[PDB]
Design a protein around this nucleic acid. Structure first.
Lengths: 357, 140, 174, 46, 42, 232
RNA sequence: GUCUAAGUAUAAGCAAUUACAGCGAAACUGCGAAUGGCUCAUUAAAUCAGUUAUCGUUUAUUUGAUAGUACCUUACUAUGGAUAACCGUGGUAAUUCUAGAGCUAAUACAUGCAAAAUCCCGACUUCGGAAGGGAUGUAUUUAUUAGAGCCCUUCGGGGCGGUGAUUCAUAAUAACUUCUCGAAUCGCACGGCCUUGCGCCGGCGAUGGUUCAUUCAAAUUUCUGCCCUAUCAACUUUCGACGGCUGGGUAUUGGCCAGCCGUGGUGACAACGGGUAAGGGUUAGGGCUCGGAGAAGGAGCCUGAGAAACGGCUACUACAUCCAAGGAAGGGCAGGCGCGCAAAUUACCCAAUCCCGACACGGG
């Protein structure tokens, strides 16, 4: 509430402190609804930037008000230019320690949350809710903006980030009142994908059963039949797993994942973008399989547990698409011929080299 | 000065040359096609539009910054003499660097918007002939 | 008294003429904008058809395009660097159209390290030209104003890159 | 004072809204099938 | 040659009789011409 | 406040209607491409007598022009607009004679329900939507894609939708709605492009008189197909 | 000046059988006055005329259409204030002079939260109708992208948006706006479902809204055509004279103006100068039609779609009015005389035609 926030700021300035004193006009111009963005770019990249001496004295009030202004719905427009670009610019112009305190105030109940224990899955935690789905989708929008405007620097807060987003995802996949939870799932998937390609060195290894519960339960027995239309965010996370060397050990968990991917490739009623998507996934798999020591830390895993048990099926599906239809995209042609070009030195013995020649 | 540039063709990209026809059965010369001169007042290079009147005539002055003058003669009918009387005019047009410019040649020029007080016009075709100085005379 | 007419001038024959007609409302010339550095000082004026245009006179932040990689951000203005017309405009630090001006680098560097992640100005697709990286470690790039601040109220334009970049840097050295 | 007539006027406004939108839907769908027929006849001549 | 950039020394007719010279000066001129004599140089 | 002598000659007016003629209100039709409604009803069709008479008759909703009631007295009724009067129960279309003067066709609802409107321009609007502008300044969203310029369209006039179209065709009977040979019913037999502006067609009559008319002022009516009943 | 069923009625206004109802003074609102014409130094292809062009521009009014834009951490919930008119207390010598005090409305100015919504796709499909896949307007500015004969054969046969032109139209992305819009209006009929719910859906218009038309304008622009004169042959560059480059403003193109440099440009085919004596279309004919500067004087400003209105304000100047002497408003044509002697209504209506407004009535 803007009026609540303004009387709040009046009592904040009733607290007379020399840190808050030289910026009080900037606080008032932030709360004035007609000068929000321009007062923000008066605050940052102006002559009167924040002095680091009383910066500790000024951070909590400004972060709290800035949270409230990102939350308030009244003056926002429709579409993305309603309030999405506001949160975008806010997190674009905020600081990383300010981002830590910002996520601290953003996470109310899930600030101290644990999703993985000494065991695999904390079902006692997962069988409870502290929050309504409105504040959940708002949380996911906030953290998606955080990860996208931060980039790499998300390392020192990971132990809160992954716990929050993975709790929301596991509550969503348990609940699969359907729209809120579907959109929770989708935006949590895309934010986790950006997180995966944002943090390479992080140990994603203390949990695997969460990825199992996300992947193998709802989709795998229907994944080509569903993705014959287009690429889904499950395919997005699989592609970022195929690109990251330390997320590729999350494909050997279920041995039928790549069979379902190659079944999506074999299905001719796909719209060729999910087909070249599967081609890109297996291309990144073979690129890891041919990459040096930094990827040879897991080469022997993918060479034996993934690629060798499916070579004949790979050749079978690619021959089915290369001999069945009378129409074929030229981008499909180039991508498939590149995949089999790089796959030829990966195999030594197979069963359909006659078919391949 | 500043930098000469085609205004809306992206050059500083890491991964074209826009030239338009004027139509009307005219041919964009290769110097206008890929010749690295850039001028906003040439029809194929710049964004100016030829329409309305098409004319021709003979240059009298090639020696100016992309601006020639066409002397337009005609046989005005004086009724008092019941005769046709020669009346020369003086015209104005912008010279693209696309064409080879000769003096005394028959140059084809078409109408665009006013680019200065005088120039409203642009060369579209040049016919190289052996025309002499201002002593010569011909209806054209 | 300021206008756009031709009645005060001479002909193609070099001859002048009176042709004195009173100055009329469709011949109107309006006083220019010296758009300089300050907080937002923009007036609004209705025109032919009552159509409102924005005369900016003091401006602080403009939107500039790092569009060779796909973003544009609203950054602050430092001051003019060069104007191809007039050194006096460069003296009094006025913002006109096509004016090369130094700007900040903080949100652009933030976007670089937010999308690619490689620190800049401190794999192969993230690649900055070395002179642009000099601007990046300076923290103050060279953009150009391609908007009319007097006739649009705003300073929008694009960052200076590559060939025009070296051209105008050499002109700075001139 | 909210009168039921005023509420009815709001209903009438939004009814004309949804009516306009479904009419745009109908004309778009019929134009789509028409253009499909026309390009089918064109390539049939081809 | 150009617009105003040359000092055309033309007698300006309305600009001709604007203001009469008003000698408002407090000293006796001998102080200052000795002063300009022994300025920094002397 | 213009004079009866400054009034154009294709809408007729005798020597006794006073020195002045009313000026038409602005609208779909052009100024000199207009017969005002009062000139129709009381000066050409003589159904009322006075200014206030015509006024009162139009203040009450008795007449509908092109399926819609019209109340302003000097509304532009330019060409082949249908005018229904339900008291007599008679509708009227506005064409020319061979002499290039306005002519009115009595007609029933059967032929009166549609309009053969000449296409002005097709475009792609906001949202990329194709729309159509006809001679009556009516726009049509999503027309049939073949209809380009110089075609006419049979229009429903009750939903206002496309009912048919006649293509610009050298071989089709047309009508002249401009120029020095205005109002001459004959067949387009040739067309010359004149790229660079002001292209023409060569159009002969039914009785071997060929003449050159501009594609601006042409107006097709049908190959033979007299889709509006010309008076005999 | 301006009123219709369709803006705002508590006139303590009239007239009557329950918020309101009819008539309706006053007031707010919206419209109007880009003209009717009056005076007087003129305008010698600059206007003007034909003839183009706007792919270089603005357009109240006309009618035609016209808006997929939810959610997006509040966990909670059909909205504001003024004020007029109105009631009263006065002032001064006082004019559209108005002070204090108390009211009230908007189509006046102002904000504006149900797990659904809406698109594009669709695998499977019984036309089933659909699993589930992706996605969330407009106005402003900048950058980017898109703008798509030959062979076989039976000789019968078989097979392989627009312009002349535009970076045009159009679409999307990235941000941008002290940037808007996406009906918190008025009247009239009042019906379907029957959860008979201060129910949900339902029609007809007036008013208002973004864009594009279109009308009506306005604004430049192209070739031609002036009358005579050399006791007018040099002229322009003397507010640039001609370019081209860059910026400013303008609705836009434009030395139109501001920086850069280049050299011009015209003329004995008649430039330039002088002189003032300032026509076109409708064709047997004559007829008939069309045709610069100012509002006491310079200077500056203000509305509107359109004025640099001559409508206003401000200064200076110059008259000149009332006055209680401290103050205060204001600048037209027509007429009669123009020797003391002379000669055409001080008529009436908007009845017709035409024009303007909330508008059938009012005013011209």
């Amino acid at each position: 509430d803007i009026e609540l926030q303004k009387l709040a700021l009046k009592a904040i300035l009733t607290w007379k402190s020399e840190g808050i004193k030289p910026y009080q006009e900037h606080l008032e111009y932030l709360l004035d609804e007609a000068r929000f963005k321009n007062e923000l770019t008066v605050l940052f990249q102006g002559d009167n930037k924040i002095l680091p001496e009383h910066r500790s004295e000024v951070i909590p009030v400004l972060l709290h008000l800035l949270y409230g202004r990102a939350i308030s719905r009244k003056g926002a427009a429709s579409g993305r230019h309603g309030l999405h670009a506001t949160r975008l610019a806010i997190i674009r112009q905020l600081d990383v320690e300010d981002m830590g305190s910002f996520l601290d105030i953003g996470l109310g109940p899930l600030r101290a949350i644990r999703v993985v224990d000494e065991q695999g899955v904390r079902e006692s935690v997962f069988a409870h809710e502290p929050l309504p789905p409105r504040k959940q989708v708002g949380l996911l929008n906030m953290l998606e903006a955080v990860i996208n405007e931060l980039g790499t620097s998300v390392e020192p807060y990971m132990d809160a980030l992954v716990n929050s987003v993975l709790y929301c995802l596991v509550n969503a996949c348990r609940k699969l009142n359907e729209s809120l939870y579907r959109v929770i799932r989708t935006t949590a998937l895309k934010s986790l994908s950006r997180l995966f390609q944002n943090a390479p060195d992080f140990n994603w290894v203390p949990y695997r059963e969460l990825m199992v519960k996300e992947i193998i339960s709802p989709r795998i027995e229907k994944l080509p039949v569903e993705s014959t239309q287009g690429v889904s965010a499950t395919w997005r996370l699989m592609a970022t797993w195929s690109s990251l060397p330390k997320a590729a050990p999350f494909l050997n968990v279920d041995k039928r994942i790549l069979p379902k991917i190659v079944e999506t490739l074999s299905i001719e009623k796909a719209k060729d973008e999910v087909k070249v998507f599967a081609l890109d996934i297996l291309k990144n798999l073979i690129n890891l399989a041919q990459a040096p020591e930094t990827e040879s830390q897991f080469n022997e895993l993918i060479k034996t547990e993934l690629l060798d048990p499916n070579t004949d099926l790979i050749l079978k599906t690619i021959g089915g698409v290369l001999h069945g239809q009378s129409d074929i995209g030229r981008e499909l042609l180039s991508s498939a011929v590149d995949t089999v070009v790089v796959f030829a030195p990966m195999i030594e013995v197979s069963s359909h080299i006659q078919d391949m020649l | 000065r500043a930098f000469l540039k085609q205004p809306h063709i992206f050059l500083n990209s890491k991964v074209r040359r826009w030239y338009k026809d004027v139509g009307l059965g005219f041919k964009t010369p290769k110097t206008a096609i890929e010749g690295h001169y850039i001028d906003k007042k040439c029809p194929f290079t710049g964004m100016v539009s030829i329409r309305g009147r098409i004319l021709t005539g003979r240059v009298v002055s090639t020696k100016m910054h992309r601006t020639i003058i066409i002397r337009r003669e005609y046989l005005h009918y004086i009724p008092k003499y019941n005769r046709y009387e020669k009346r020369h005019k003086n015209l104005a047009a912008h010279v693209s660097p696309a064409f080879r410019v000769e003096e005394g040649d028959m140059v084809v020029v078409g109408q665009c918007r006013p680019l200065s007080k005088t120039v409203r016009f642009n060369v579209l075709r040049v016919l190289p002939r052996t025309g002499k100085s201002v002593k010569k005379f011909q209806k054209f | 008294g300021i206008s756009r007419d031709s009645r005060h001038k001479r002909s193609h024959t070099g001859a002048k003429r009176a042709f004195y007609r009173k100055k009329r409302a469709f011949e109107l010339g309006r006083q220019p904008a010296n758009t300089r550095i300050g907080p937002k000082r923009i007036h609004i004026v209705r025109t032919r058809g009552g159509n409102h245009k924005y005369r900016a006179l003091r401006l602080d932040s403009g939107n500039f395009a790092w569009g060779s990689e796909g973003c544009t951000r609203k950054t602050r203005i430092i001051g003019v660097v060069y104007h191809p017309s007039n050194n006096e405009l460069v003296r009094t630090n006025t913002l006109t159209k096509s004016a090369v001006v130094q700007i900040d680098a903080a949100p652009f560097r933030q976007w670089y390290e937010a999308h690619y992640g490689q620190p800049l100005g401190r794999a192969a697709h993230g690649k900055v030209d070395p002179a642009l990286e000099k601007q990046f470690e300076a923290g103050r790039l060279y953009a150009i104003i391609s908007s009319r601040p007097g006739q649009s109220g705003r300073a929008d334009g694009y960052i200076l890159e590559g060939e025009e970049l070296a051209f105008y840097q050499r002109k700075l050295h001139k | 004072l909210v009168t039921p007539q005023r509420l009815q006027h709001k209903r009438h406004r939004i009814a004309l809204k949804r009516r306009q939108q479904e009419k745009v839907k109908e004309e778009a769908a019929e134009y789509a099938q028409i253009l499909a027929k026309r390009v089918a006849e064109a390539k049939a001549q081809k | 040659a150009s617009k105003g950039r040359k000092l055309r020394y033309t007698v300006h007719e309305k600009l001709q009789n604007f203001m009469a010279p008003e000698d408002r000066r407090s000293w006796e001129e001998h102080a200052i011409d000795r002063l300009f004599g022994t300025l920094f140089g002397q | 406040h213009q004079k009866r002598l400054s009034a154009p000659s294709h809408w007729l007016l005798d020597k006794l209607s006073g020195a002045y003629a009313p000026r038409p209100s602005t609208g779909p039709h052009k100024l000199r491409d207009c017969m005002p409604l009062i000139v129709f009803v009381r000066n050409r069709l003589k159904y009322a007598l006075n200014y206030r008479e015509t006024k009162a008759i139009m203040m009450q909703r008795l007449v509908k022009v092109d399926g819609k009631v019209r109340t302003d007295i000097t509304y532009p009724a330019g060409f082949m607009d249908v005018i229904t009067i339900e008291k007599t129960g008679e509708n009227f279309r506005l064409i020319y004679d061979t002499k290039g003067r306005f002519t009115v066709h009595r007609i029933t609802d059967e032929e009166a329900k549609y309009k053969l409107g000449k296409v002005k321009r097709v475009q792609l609007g906001r949202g990329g939507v194709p729309f159509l502008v006809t001679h009556d300044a009516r726009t049509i969203r999503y027309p049939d894609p073949l209809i380009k310029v110089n075609d006419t369209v049979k229009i429903d006039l009750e939903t206002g939708k496309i009912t048919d179209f006649i293509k610009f065709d050298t071989g089709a009977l047309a009508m002249i709605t401009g120029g020095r040979n205005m109002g001459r019913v004959g067949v387009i037999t040739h067309r010359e492009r004149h790229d660079g502006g002001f292209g023409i067609v060569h159009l002969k009559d039914a009785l071997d008189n060929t003449f050159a008319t501009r594609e601006s002022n042409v107006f097709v009516i049908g190959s033979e197909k007299p889709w509006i009943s010309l008076p005999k």
